[PDB]
Amino acid sequence: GSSGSSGVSKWSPSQVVDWMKGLDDCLQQYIKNFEREKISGDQLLRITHQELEDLGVSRIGHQELILEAVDLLCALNSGPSSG
Fold it and tell me: Which residue ranges does the record assign to the SAM domain?
């Protein structure tokens, strides 16, 4: 095609919000911040402690909670996609 297999990188700023809806309950209060911040996939895939802090996530156990989940979003992409 153009490069290979990429989807989470082109995730809309509103789509990412739906993802948090299926994560830890502690990462819910942050959702309200992700909606106004319009966090796009291109940013999520490259999300860092600094970014999370901006949204409001000051805690540590929570900052990693989301990251640990992101690792799966990338690990699933690199793998075999479609049939």
Answer: 11-76
Q: Report the C-alpha gap between 33 and 45 in whole angstroms.
A: 17
Cα 4 from chain centroid (whole Å): 20
Number of domains in the chain: 1
Tell me the chain's radius of gyration from C-alpha atoms: 13
Helix (H, G, I), strand (E, B) or coil at 16: helix
Report the CATH number that the domain containing residue 24 is assigned in CATH.
1.10.150.50
Cα separation of 77 and 55, whole Å? 26
**8 Cβ neighbours under 8 A, 6+ residues apart:** 41, 44, 45, 73, 74, 77
Range of the domain at 54: 1-83
